[PDB]
Design a protein around this ligand. Structure first.
Ligand SMILES: O=c1ccn([C@@H]2O[C@H](COP(=O)(O)NP(=O)(O)OP(=O)(O)O)[C@@H](O)[C@H]2O)c(=O)[nH]1
Ligand SMILES: O=c1ccn([C@@H]2O[C@H](COP(=O)(O)NP(=O)(O)OP(=O)(O)O)[C@@H](O)[C@H]2O)c(=O)[nH]1
Ligand SMILES: O=c1ccn([C@@H]2O[C@H](COP(=O)(O)NP(=O)(O)OP(=O)(O)O)[C@@H](O)[C@H]2O)c(=O)[nH]1
Ligand SMILES: O=c1ccn([C@@H]2O[C@H](COP(=O)(O)NP(=O)(O)OP(=O)(O)O)[C@@H](O)[C@H]2O)c(=O)[nH]1
Ligand SMILES: [Mg+2]
Ligand SMILES: [Mg+2]
Ligand SMILES: [Mg+2]
Ligand SMILES: [Mg+2]
Ligand SMILES: [Mg+2]
Lengths: 298, 292
């Protein structure tokens, strides 16, 4: 296996029409909102997120992630500021539940009932008439306070799944930090993200169980953590090896964040843990070598 | 220990019920969207039955999915004398329920394979391990029950036309909403007791008590829904079950009960069950709970 040529091939985008798919999904979801007499009067931002936005998508059948964010509903994380975490007696006019229901109705009115399915977190939209395949998430404004000052917060999005709980997302920070790192590495960062995502997909489809619990976004975060110096040179294989090496040797003592540099990459709030990452890294390290004499599951 | 037994029997069939229902819905929706005929039609694909209503107790229960063609309408005018299709603005359709059901069969077989799809008199039985689908997929069209001569004075549900003939009206949205309302008013005790009594019926049926055999799950869900909320209070599930059995046995003869949708009458020539069967089962269950 020529891993240099394979990684160069695997560094490509899923296609050259990714911007087209993302913009078409965005515009059709905006049209769905604008046709809703309830939602068209609300303060709502519709924007792409996920791997299509970040140019890290590698699968052509990947749904476009569209965030529909109601800006006038706010949920804040006060856990970092001592003494910052009452209730008002008047109810807020619009609730997250009513917002998600009205979004469901708007999507169904625009794309038809066959094209919309309500999920726990987002709507799965598959509308052949408009050729839209999208994961459309209802979000509200999310805040992380870092001081007791009224303006001392970072702004992102917040999701309230049907099954309970609160999820904080930072899509703008994700995108912006990824672009910044791509500039600092002369575009090598996202090339290597895509190569490693395709490596993980390859391993998962070949039945390597260590690859299955390692999703795309986790790998984007992990590769983002690798210092820029390891992306230099003219060997993509050396870049991949540097990433695996750095991550494996630094993960145990680390307290890494996601690519947004706001949310912790590991903890009880995440679906993954350091052991799974380490097992995957060992699998990947062995798999790219030319001839292994021995195997490491001990 | 009937208290702990009923508490255990009140649990859902598993912790993955919502996942199973959603997967069934999405895979059937994908089959429809792959159909060159059906993908352009106004069709709703949605779960109904015990998975939708959170009253399922058997892990091997198939997910009930309704595939409803909304642009075909069958109207019930039996409550409004002098109401017809012209007074309801319904144009005659070229497309028939028969061909719709055949096209649904084709869509399902194309996605899940011929081996994974069986046509029944009412619905398709779908069992495809590759997609992890175990479902009863019923073809329905829009059904209407008119309550006045106004052209918008109707209640909307679904309508099924079995291969062997006849017409069945269903009201899955009303079923779901009324069940949710009663579950809220009783602090979730309603559906816990529904599940406990369904497991009691299944236990009795598998032990050879013949009176349990003609008592299906949906009938018991309706019957428990009828019981007033006061009998779901307290901290004894056993007392809740006994209250339901007592109330139902003592009120059934003079009653004119409806299904949980509060639209269809629970007993009559349109149903597969009758009051005598319910009473025989209630006596069986009451005696079985006492003699143990
Ligand atoms: O666990 C998660 C999953 C998803 N997300 C957020 O939701 C976005 C989209 O969720 P996603 O599952 O589509 N992941 P994505 O990065 O688009 O990769 P892929 O579709 O496989 O090519 C991610 O990019 C994250 O920003 C999380 O923050 N945490
Ligand atoms: O943190 C998150 C997690 C999830 N999401 C968004 O919510 C969607 C659903 O997230 P999901 O975990 O419910 N299911 P998934 O397998 O990712 O996709 P699907 O097959 O459509 O059910 C994801 O695809 C993301 O777009 C976020 O936006 N942020
Ligand atoms: O006689 C019937 C049978 C079924 N149905 C409708 O069809 C739905 C599903 O039919 P079902 O036979 O699966 N009964 P279900 O309530 O799901 O309980 P379970 O044994 O756990 O599967 C039922 O919930 C009813 O709403 C009727 O309306 N009348
Ligand atoms: O009123 C009805 C009746 C039936 N159905 C749907 O049609 C499916 C088949 O209905 P069925 O009566 O042909 N067979 P069923 O009693 O459900 O199972 P079994 O005893 O093992 O033969 C049911 O499981 C429901 O999903 C309805 O949706 N509404
Ligand atoms: Mg994505
Ligand atoms: Mg997605
Ligand atoms: Mg999706
Ligand atoms: Mg059922
Ligand atoms: Mg069934």
């Amino acid at each position: 296996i020529d891993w240099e040529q394979t990684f160069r091939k695997w560094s490509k985008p899923s296609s050259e029409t990714e911007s087209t798919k993302a913009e078409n999904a965005e515009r059709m979801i905006k049209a769905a909102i604008n046709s809703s007499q309830i939602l068209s009067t609300k303060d709502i931002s519709v924007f792409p997120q996920g791997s299509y936005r970040n140019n890290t998508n590698v699968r052509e059948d990947s749904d476009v992630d569209i965030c529909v964010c109601l800006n006038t509903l706010v949920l804040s994380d006060y856990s970092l500021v001592p003494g910052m975490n009452l209730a008002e007696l008047r109810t807020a006019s619009y609730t997250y539940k009513q917002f998600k229901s009205d979004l469901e109705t708007a999507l169904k009115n625009k794309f038809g009932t066959l094209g919309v399915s309500r999920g726990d977190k987002a709507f799965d939209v598959h509308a052949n008439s408009y050729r839209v395949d999208a994961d459309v998430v209802p979000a509200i404004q999310g805040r992380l306070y870092y001081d007791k000052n009224h303006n001392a917060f970072i702004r992102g999005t917040c999701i309230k799944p049907d099954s309970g709980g609160t999820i904080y997302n930072w899509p703008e920070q994700n995108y912006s930090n990824g672009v910044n790192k791509n500039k600092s590495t002369g575009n090598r960062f996202k090339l290597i993200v895509r190569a490693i995502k395709r490596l993980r997909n390859h391993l998962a489809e070949k039945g390597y169980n260590t690859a299955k619990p390692i999703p795309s976004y986790l790998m984007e975060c992990l590769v983002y953590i690798v210092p820029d110096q390891y992306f230099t040179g003219d060997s993509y294989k050396t870049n991949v090896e540097n990433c695996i090496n750095y991550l494996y040797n630094q993960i145990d003592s680390s307290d890494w964040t996601e690519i947004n540099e706001i949310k912790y990459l590991f903890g009880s709030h995440q679906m993954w843990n350091k052991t799974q990452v380490k097992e995957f890294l060992l699998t990947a390290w062995s798999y790219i070598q030319k001839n292994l004499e021995h195997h490491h599951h001990h």
